[PDB]
């Protein structure tokens with residue numbers, strides 16, 4: 001209990017829904033900040049990127 | 050020592066003895082092209098990461 005490597009994702013981080021229009025807090029892959037989101041069609045990404 | 054299943058000759062694959070799976074932090078598999086010339090790898094550490 002309260003140890004080991006077997007945990008669960010039942011915390012507040014439960015795959016929340018994205019939103020556009022208002023700047024919110026950022027926790028995207030160990031990065032913080034704020035900013036308005038805007039949907040844009042981009043195709044310069046890769047699998048590891 | 051470690052052998053490969055591709056036409057084994059004498060020895061067998063045996064490098065550790067563990068009757069139970071210990072606490073593991075990372076374990077995964079990746080794929081690559083089986084028909085290539087050479088494979089490059091790069092390892093390092095910084096600030097404990």
Ligand SMILES: *[C@@H]1O[C@H](CO)[C@@H](O[C@@H]2O[C@H](CO)[C@@H](O)[C@H](O)[C@H]2NC(C)=O)[C@H](O)[C@H]1NC(C)=O
Pocket residue numbers: 082083084085
């Ligand atoms: C794995 O590597 C081989 C050789 O490097 C790739 O075969 C080449 O594929 C290209 C794309 O059609 C051809 O133009 C070359 O003539 C092929 N070379 C040979 C020697 O066959 C193969 O496509 C690679 N596979 C993957 C999944 O990356």
